[PDB]
Design a protein around this nucleic acid. Structure first.
Ligand SMILES: O=P(O)(O)O[C@H]1[C@H](OP(=O)(O)O)[C@@H](OP(=O)(O)O)[C@H](OP(=O)(O)O)[C@@H](OP(=O)(O)O)[C@H]1OP(=O)(O)O
Ligand SMILES: [Mg+2]
Ligand SMILES: [Mg+2]
Ligand SMILES: [Mg+2]
Ligand SMILES: [Mg+2]
Ligand SMILES: [Mg+2]
Ligand SMILES: [Zn+2]
Ligand SMILES: [Zn+2]
Ligand SMILES: [Zn+2]
Lengths: 193, 48, 193, 182, 261
RNA sequence: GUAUGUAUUUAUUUUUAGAUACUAACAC
RNA sequence: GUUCGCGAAGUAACCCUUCGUGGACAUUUGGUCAAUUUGAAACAAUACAGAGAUGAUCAGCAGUUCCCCUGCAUAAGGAUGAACCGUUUUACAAAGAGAUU
RNA sequence: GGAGGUCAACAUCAAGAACUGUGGGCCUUUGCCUAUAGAACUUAUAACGAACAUGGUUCUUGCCUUUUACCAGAAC
């Protein structure tokens, strides 16, 4: 609903939350259709959820197994780097992944002692704790962003928009204050007209 | 008829303030009275 | 609301975009309630929007800490036995479903199909006689006057022999180091310094 | 503050015979039907159980300027359409007092903000040659009616019925040319 | 009375029969938020109504009557209403009494309970203004009759008269031969609204004549709100009417004003 | 391997050779 | 419909059932919104046009506006975002010389 | 009346190692001195959480065309 409401019907979402154009786009389309970190971040995030919820589904369908499940969500929570692409829209998340890899190694050695190199595993407590706390982090952040995205979507963007001085536009402002300051003086020296 | 005035609890999801929408407006300047502006060259231009 | 094209949805559509702001919270509350391996199906309290706008999982999982560590370590041992046991351990493919297959409706496929046994462990009849019964319950002790507060499930209280069994089971995850003095330059204050 | 503080303006008519009434106040409701700016909205129901619901349409300003009722949009005193009261007033004097209104947008959006108080406000088978509601009404009470046709450009046309038409022949002609059509 | 008052209203259309939403393929892909089509623009989308009403046949009592609602079902005016006697709104053609009940609230909003707008509309569209009481409908797109050419304009005139004639008390009607338009004028604002919503997108001639069974391919006739009348005659007629009515309400003003003292 | 801009009204409102040339997402 | 109770009848021996009646318990939901053409999303396609400073090719920052778009944004982009690139007469006098009344 | 509730509202939870009420004396209510009663929860390898996330401003760096997104330390 947010995609179509923006007027873009040519971006298709699949059911794994990958967002692809269904068409070749004119330039004006590519400009209209660049979506921010709000949307995309939240897309990646749901994609993670959907992924896990699916693994449990295939367990209840009988299609899988007991242990293959636990190994499954372990594999997810460790490999989020590779399975998602959330790391694009907040690069900070790279901390968690590093954490979630380290645990992996620590976990494997105790687990893997005396037996095997294979995939068998499935102690997912620590990684789950990590992702979960990261998710504590961005609740307020996404509430803020998507709040602005949608309030801007109903109510239009602000008309005032004052814009601060920064590295780029500084010299221009310096010029401007100066020419004004000279106007004042040279107007107040003159006798009248 | 008197009256009793009562607020309605909004559906938290729906926009509160259904009609708040950024729009720009030109206001008139309504001048009721005039403020008298009350103050107290020849060769000068050749200087200035 | 799956199919909505009518005009009667004009508020519900507005209602959806609003909820877009609260989603990541719903993802948290959902994902912290994951059912854990030994449980087959959790059952939760959701709080939903009357127009089907969004569904929150309203609960927070509470677990007796010694019991929880016992449970999770039992599963640990079962994992190791199972990795040693069977020759071909088959890691399920990711993502579980293909992009074009709509997510299958729970009220049809899944709900009829029977849960297919979880991890658990053989335990022992003689040694664990105290904790054999309730160890794998969803919430371990709900109705007990003595063993726990109530269904509100806070403030656990136990007996000695139980704690002896839980203490026994949890050996692979237990701290194991019995003196302070072992950490000499490894405590916090030595790291800060 | 600015929007709330002026209280609503409601007629006594549309507000109903109930002694005490419960009305809802929404701090940003629809924009005016007129100025197109937000304001504060008021529900109410005449009856407690009446199904129908009353919703103030215009601003307080856009009302006060025109001195009308927010639910009715009739004159606050005389209960008259705005396009009338200024015609009555215009009858006294000669030609004036028409309320000139605001096309475009920020013409109107502008205009509502001035304190002017407005022009209006300040004072306050038988073929028959030589409307259709009157003919059908008169011929309706004296007999059987089926259809009428009149072409006012030709000033004459049919009147068709399903004996009773001869009962009509008592009063029909010259009241009016009426004969028996072909 | 014998016709309408006693006989309870009869369901026009079974709910399964009602048209689907999602009008057909005006564009490449469907759009969920607005209900329209996406890319490209198909030939302009307008179509004759598969439905119509039958004033004496369908109309009958409903729940609003007992509940004393003021406003009329438009799905009845389109004869598309699927709620039958269960409907919340009145099913029958407006009379003078009921307009008598609406009279206070007819100012801001139409007989169907929809707020009027201020400016009319660029093309003189759906609902009118609350500035100006306009009782005159413009009938256009007379090719709602499809391509059949007729022996005279008395075909068009006669047929229209028999169409709108049912819907309410007609003050006058003029078809124009040169430019294809009818101008129809009623006693009451209410009947004008009701008739406008009733006859928009409709067909003509007999339940069966000639091409009748192909009627559904037609465009359907515009019924819009009508502008003023430029000729001097009717302009006099309006000016006078306004005069005498102003005079009539001055009586009220002086009666209650006399009561004011 | 040009942004960008303008227009896209269909349904009927009352009275004989070539030199100097310009340019070419076409060839280092 | 539950319960307290009264009366009548019947079984009964103050109990079981039926009937009638008194009292208590319980007490005003929902809508700013009706279901496709006639109360309003822009894109795309087609035709024409064809990117600031310059002799010429190219970086750019701003500034004014009843133009805004993408963006979480008080970063930054949108051709240096666009529009601008045009029309242009009186606070009016002083002096001198010639023609007409 | 007792037990409870993945019920709600209102209080309170980081400080002179620290709370409140009351009796008496001095100054002139505050405040100081003296007498007396009761102090739930949280604190000493310091704290409501035996757990652990993010954002803003300001400095210092690190990547290094520029902005988001960032590197890793500090203070608020
Ligand atoms: O780096 P490697 O020497 O190949 O180690 C691999 C590798 O672990 P890391 O990539 O984290 O170092 C595998 O992971 P990926 O190749 O998928 O990245 C992992 O397999 P899983 O991903 O299934 O855990 C595997 O585990 P195992 O130890 O069971 O072989 C592990 O092996 P080693 O760490 O023993 O080499
Ligand atoms: Mg810029
Ligand atoms: Mg350039
Ligand atoms: Mg650029
Ligand atoms: Mg610019
Ligand atoms: Mg730049
Ligand atoms: Zn207004
Ligand atoms: Zn009123
Ligand atoms: Zn109906």
């Amino acid at each position: 609903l947010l995609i179509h409401r923006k007027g873009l019907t040519y971006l298709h979402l699949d059911y794994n939350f990958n967002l692809k154009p269904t068409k070749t786009l004119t330039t004006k389309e590519r400009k209209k259709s660049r979506l921010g970190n709000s949307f995309h971040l939240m897309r990646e995030l749901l994609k993670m959820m959907k992924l896990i919820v699916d693994t449990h589904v295939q367990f209840r369908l009988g299609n899988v197994d007991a242990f293959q499940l636990a190994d499954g969500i372990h594999y997810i929570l460790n490999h989020i780097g590779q399975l998602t692409g959330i790391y694009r829209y907040k690069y900070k998340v790279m901390h968690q992944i590093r954490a979630c890899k380290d645990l992996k190694h620590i976990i494997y050695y105790k687990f893997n002692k005396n037996l095997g190199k294979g995939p068998g595993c499935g102690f997912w407590q620590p990684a789950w704790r990590v992702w979960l706390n990261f998710l504590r982090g961005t609740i307020p952040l996404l509430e803020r962003y998507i709040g602005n995205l949608i309030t801007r979507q109903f109510e239009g963007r602000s008309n005032e928009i004052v814009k601060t001085t920064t590295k780029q536009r500084l010299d221009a402002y310096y010029d401007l204050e100066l020419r004004n300051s000279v106007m004042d003086d040279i107007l107040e020296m003159m006798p009248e007209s | 008829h008197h009256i009793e005035v009562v607020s309605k609890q909004m559906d938290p999801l729906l926009p509160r303030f259904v009609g708040k929408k950024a729009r720009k407006v030109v206001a008139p300047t309504e001048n009721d009275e005039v403020v008298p502006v009350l103050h107290m060259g020849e060769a000068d231009p050749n200087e200035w | 609301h799956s199919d909505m094209a009518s005009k009667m949805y004009n508020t519900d559509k507005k209602a959806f975009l609003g909820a877009l702001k609260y989603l990541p919270h719903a993802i948290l509350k959902l994902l912290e309630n994951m059912p854990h391996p030994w449980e087959q199906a959790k059952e939760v309290k959701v709080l939903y929007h009357t127009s089907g706008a969004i569904t929150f999982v309203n609960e927070t999982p509470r677990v007796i800490e010694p019991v929880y560590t016992a449970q999770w370590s039992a599963t640990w041992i079962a994992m190791r036995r199972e990795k040693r046991d069977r020759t071909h351990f088959k890691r399920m493919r990711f993502p579980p479903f293909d992009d074009d297959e709509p997510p299958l409706s729970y009220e049809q496929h899944i709900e009829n199909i029977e849960p297919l046994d979880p991890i658990n462990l053989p335990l022992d009849s003689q040694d664990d006689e105290y904790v054999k019964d309730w160890l794998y319950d969803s919430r371990p002790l709900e109705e007990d006057s003595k063993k726990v507060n109530g269904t509100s499930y806070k403030k656990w209280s136990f007996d000695l022999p139980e704690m002896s069994n839980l203490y026994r089971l949890s050996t692979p995850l237990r701290d194991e180091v019995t003196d302070k003095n072992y950490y000499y330059l490894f405590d916090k204050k030595s790291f800060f310094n | 503050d600015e929007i709330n503080e002026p209280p609503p303006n409601i007629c006594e008519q549309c507000l109903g015979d109930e002694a005490n009434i419960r009305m809802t106040k929404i701090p940003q409701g629809s924009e005016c039907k007129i100025c197109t700016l937000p304001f504060t909205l008021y529900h109410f129901k005449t009856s407690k159980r009446s199904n129908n619901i009353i919703k103030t349409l215009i601003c307080v300003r856009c009302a006060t300027q025109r001195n009308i009722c927010q639910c009715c949009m009739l004159d606050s005193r005389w209960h008259i359409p705005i396009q009338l009261r200024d015609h009555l007033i215009s009858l006294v004097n000669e030609e004036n007092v028409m309320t000139e209104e605001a096309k475009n947008d920020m013409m109107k959006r502008f205009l509502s903000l001035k304190n002017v108080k407005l022009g209006g406000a300040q004072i306050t088978i038988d073929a028959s040659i030589p409307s259709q509601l009157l003919g059908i009404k008169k011929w309706k009470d004296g007999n059987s009616l089926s259809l009428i046709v009149n072409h006012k450009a030709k000033c004459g046309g049919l009147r068709f019925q399903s004996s009773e038409t001869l009962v009509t022949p008592k009063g029909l002609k010259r009241g009016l040319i009426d004969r028996f059509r072909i | 009375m014998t016709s309408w008052r006693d006989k309870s209203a009869k369901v026009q259309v079974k709910e399964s029969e009602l048209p689907s939403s999602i009008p057909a393929q005006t564009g490449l892909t469907f759009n969920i938020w607005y209900n329209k089509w996406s890319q490209g623009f198909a030939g302009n989308t307008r179509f004759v109504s598969p439905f119509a009403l039958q004033p004496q046949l369908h109309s009958g009592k409903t729940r609003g009557d007992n509940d004393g609602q003021l406003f009329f079902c438009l799905f009845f005016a389109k004869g598309m209403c699927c709620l039958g006697p269960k409907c919340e709104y009145l099913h029958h053609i407006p009379d003078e009494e009921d307009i008598g009940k609406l009279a206070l609230r007819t100012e801001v909003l139409d007989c169907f309970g929809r707020e009027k707008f201020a400016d009319y509309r660029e093309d003189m569209g759906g609902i009118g203004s609350f500035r100006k009481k306009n009782k005159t409908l413009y009938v256009g797109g007379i090719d709602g009759a499809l391509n059949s050419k007729h022996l005279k304009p008395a075909q068009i005139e006669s047929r229209i008269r028999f169409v709108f004639s049912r819907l309410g008390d007609i003050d006058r009607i003029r078809y124009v031969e040169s430019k294809n338009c009818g101008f129809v004028k009623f006693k009451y604002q209410a009947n004008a609204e009701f008739a406008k919503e009733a006859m928009s997108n409709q067909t003509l001639l007999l339940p069966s004549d000639k091409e009748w069974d192909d009627r559904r391919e037609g465009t359907g006739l515009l019924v819009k709100w009508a502008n003023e009348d430029p000729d001097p005659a009717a302009q006099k007629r309006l000016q006078e009417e306004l005069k005498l009515e102003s005079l009539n309400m001055m009586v009220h003003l002086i009666n209650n004003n006399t009561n004011s003292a």
